[PDB]
Write a structure and sequence with these properties.
This is part of a larger assembly, with two copies of chain A.
Chain A: H1 3-8, H2 10-25, H3 31-34
């Protein structure tokens, strides 16, 4: 009786643990500060 | 860059004593903002411009003293 609610709410959130699965197969956390170019981007210009 | 070739790996942190010297090439200065060699070479160019101005055909025996009061 409760399993169908646990799979209908999973229809938005079973992908969310699948989102965590893709999160652990990616090492791209934060894009290592949104890397623009060979400019420094820590010397000025929203540096930190 | 010759000094930057042979110390990049520890062999991040550098297990050799090329640590603080290679903190000047481009250290990605995260809050330890003392100086970068990119910035220090720019302050050489301003002095190049000013020392080119006095020699720039304006009687440099006068323009030197005309700058020497600004110091």
């Amino acid at each position: 009786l409760l399993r169908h609610l646990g799979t209908q709410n999973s229809d938005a959130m079973l992908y969310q643990k699948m989102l965590a699965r893709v999160a652990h197969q990616f090492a791209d956390m934060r894009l290592t500060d949104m890397t623009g170019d060979t400019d420094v981007s820590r010397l000025f210009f929203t540096d930190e | 860059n010759t000094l930057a070739v042979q110390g990049r790996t520890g062999q991040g942190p550098l297990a050799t004593t090329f640590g603080p010297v290679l903190a000047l090439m481009d250290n990605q200065n995260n809050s330890a903002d003392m100086l970068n060699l990119q910035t220090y070479l720019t302050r050489v160019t301003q002095v190049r411009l000013r020392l080119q101005q006095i020699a720039g055909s304006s009687d440099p025996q006068a323009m030197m003293q005309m700058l020497a009061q600004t110091v």
